[PDB]
Scaffold this active site. Sequence first.
Site: not given
Ligand SMILES: [Cl-]
Length: 294
Positions: A36, A106-107, A130, A270
């Site tokens: 995201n 991330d996701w 990350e 990030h």
């Molecule tokens: Cl998020």
Amino acid sequence: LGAKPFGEKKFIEIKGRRMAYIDEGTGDPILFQHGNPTSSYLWRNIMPHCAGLGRLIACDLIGMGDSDKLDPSGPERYAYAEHRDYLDALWEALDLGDRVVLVVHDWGSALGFDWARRHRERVQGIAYMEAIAMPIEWADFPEQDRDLFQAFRSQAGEELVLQDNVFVEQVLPGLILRPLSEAEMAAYREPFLAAGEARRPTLSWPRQIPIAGTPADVVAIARDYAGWLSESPIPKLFINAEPGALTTGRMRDFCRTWPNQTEITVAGAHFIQEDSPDEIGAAIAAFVRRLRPA
Ligand SMILES: [Cl-]
Ligand SMILES: [Ca+2]
Ligand SMILES: [Ca+2]
Ligand SMILES: [Ca+2]
């Protein structure tokens, strides 16, 4: 390294919803999964480094990139389980074989780590950065955006995200150390130009992060893949970031316990792919060359 996308978008119907993805090259897959509020575009400057080393694939999560939006959208839509249902089906449709290298962020890491735990015999290696490597607590969340993320996970989230597009317009640039160009930001905002539900995946995602025990289903899934990764002998490449953002503190301490893991540190917060794409791509390509010797 540039604003031009890598390869060309291909589409495939999944659960009646057209999903978009990049699929270039031949051989065993090197599967890049964004999180995201990004898309396959996040990897555009990294995938070139793996030219000739495999079938380079980068899928756009449902509701993101060029993948179709779910309709009717609302607060119950785009939860992790729904994303997994579409992503599992797309990966099955792509006929990936049994020696897949996952490259996740991330996701994309929650989804890829969970997929790996459920299809462990098909995973040749995992490169991550990350990531959401385990359930965390608010004290583990980076301080700079802690209050903002608590606000996303409150009734204030709809105005912040659906109305004002705060994830794309504020969080994304705020967690990239170098300035993005006009074209790069256009690529990131394109799936989210319209206010309202079009932006829902970017709000549903922060509400799904396993933090302080909620949502419990995702906390359980992350607890499961965390325990499994901590014991799995599958080769791993941990791309640590400095200063980093999510994979710092206790989560980084935990990631550093994982077996058969190589680690490099690159500059970034990030969305480190926008800060150190060449360092990241060179590391991934070297990891894949070690996993796929001639
Ligand atoms: Cl998020
Ligand atoms: Ca084979
Ligand atoms: Ca607070
Ligand atoms: Ca910035």
